[PDB]
């Protein structure tokens, strides 16, 4: 078979070339090219023969698919396609990396390489590929060919394109493309080519595609942008005694503390169940569930998406719970738990510091991998029956590696303490639509909350 005869029609090819050259939009029955937020093009009915495409779908669906998972994505990818001998796949390689490539090279004036770079992806319920720019040395043009059944926005899996802010960081979704059978999309890989595949919501259907890159000369990426560090602050000096009113007495016993520290020093992590006194814990959950709290959304999408409480406007019990975690007394307690020097009265410049926030996590929220030693603290509220399959767990990994070192699962009134070295990173995995199963049990609840603090020696 062959890709659409109608785009190789020379008058159209030259008009497309002009539009590329001038970075100007161009619309036609068989091809649309847009420049906002960045250069992307859509070719419906990319391949003329429906029979070839059905034969292609069949071969692909008869491949073995392996699970792909990390902070950025969750989906299935095929046995690789490059050396694959099945005839429809073989033909497609040639259609893409000889015929279509020469056409693209001509209109783009980019000398694209023959290098074959293509995979087959399957996205099903809860699968998603979050905000990213495709940047990798050599990648110049991204392409995706959809081989999906009848598809609509409600089924998810949209190819979303982001606008960008002053600092070359993604701002928000300004284009959302719906996949459809035999539609090809391609776009330029650049420092601003931010995009995602939105979560697939259909529980029945499977989003099938061929995707990859045409390789070309390495462009010029600008300097790596570093966000303004979140302000840190020393402990709130002690006025009134606050620990014995808030903390489970078990954990305020000295002999239990040395045992905790013994365990903590071996693994540099611990999990303390029923950390707060239930009297307080329930008042805290009560306020979160029935009180007035002002939330704001945190970004940008290529780093994070979750809700954070406006701390100054919190109900007193939540204000006080935050003050607890900022308090001199807790700094000292954590020293006793960990053997870290977070207070001057703890055994043996430096002034210890912390940053903290009250977070709300629900469907769609996440953080991604982006150096310093630090102690992470999390206290979970309102997540009974929360399942790992929902996402929302915190995963710790070794840097420059795919190795998970630890997983923290939301559990009510459990305090997780985890020490990070400079070669250790963390993220909160994308919370997917299975989490809606929560409402079968707690109909008036949506997601869960935590107190998330970081302490520095
Ligand atoms: O499949 C899509 O619609 C978009 N794919 C990608 O951005 C990718 O695989 O890197
Ligand atoms: Mn991509
Ligand atoms: Na570490």
Residue numbers in the entry: 24 to 371, 430 to 451, 456 to 542
Publication excerpt:
OGFOD1 crystallized in both trigonal (OGFOD1:Mn(II):NOG) and orthorhombic (OGFOD1:Mn(II):2,4-PDCA) crystal systems with either one or four molecules per asymmetric unit (ASU), respectively. Following optimization of hits from high-throughput crystallization trials, diffraction quality crystals for full-length H. sapiens OGFOD1 (542 amino acids [aa], 63 kDa) and S. cerevisiae Tpa1p (644 aa, 74 kDa) in complex with Mn(II) and inhibitors were obtained (catalytically inactive Mn(II) was used as an Fe(II) surrogate). In all of the OGFOD1 and Tpa1p structures, the inhibitors ligate the metal in a bidentate manner. With OGFOD1 the C-5 carboxylate of NOG is positioned to form hydrogen bonds to the side chains of Tyr169 and Arg230 (analogous interactions occur with Tpa1p); the latter is part of a conserved RXS motif that binds to the 2OG C-5 carboxylate in a large subfamily of 2OG oxygenases (e.g. deacetoxycephalosporin C synthase) (Ser232 Oγ and NOG C-5 carboxylate oxygen distance is 4.4 Å) (Clifton et al., 2006; Aik et al., 2012). A glycerol molecule is observed in the apparent OGFOD1 substrate binding site and forms a hydrogen bond to the NOG oxalyl carboxylate (2.3 Å).
OGFOD1 in Homo sapiens, Sud1 in Drosophila melanogaster, and Tpa1p in Saccharomyces cerevisiae were found to catalyze prolyl 3-hydroxylation of the highly conserved Pro62 and Pro64 of uS12 (RPS23) in humans and yeast, respectively (Ban et al., 2014; Katz et al., 2014; Loenarz et al., 2014; Singleton et al., 2014). We describe crystal structures of the human uS12 prolyl 3-hydroxylase (OGFOD1) and its homolog from Saccharomyces cerevisiae (Tpa1p): OGFOD1 in complex with the broad-spectrum 2OG oxygenase inhibitors; N-oxalylglycine (NOG) and pyridine-2,4-dicarboxylate (2,4-PDCA) to 2.1 and 2.6 Å resolution, respectively; and Tpa1p in complex with NOG, 2,4-PDCA, and 1-chloro-4-hydroxyisoquinoline-3-carbonylglycine (a more selective prolyl hydroxylase inhibitor) to 2.8, 1.9, and 1.9 Å resolution, respectively. Prior to its assignment as a uS12 P3H, crystal structures of Tpa1p revealed that it contains tandem DSBH domains, only one of which, the N-terminal domain, was predicted to harbor the catalytic machinery (Kim et al., 2009; Henri et al., 2010).
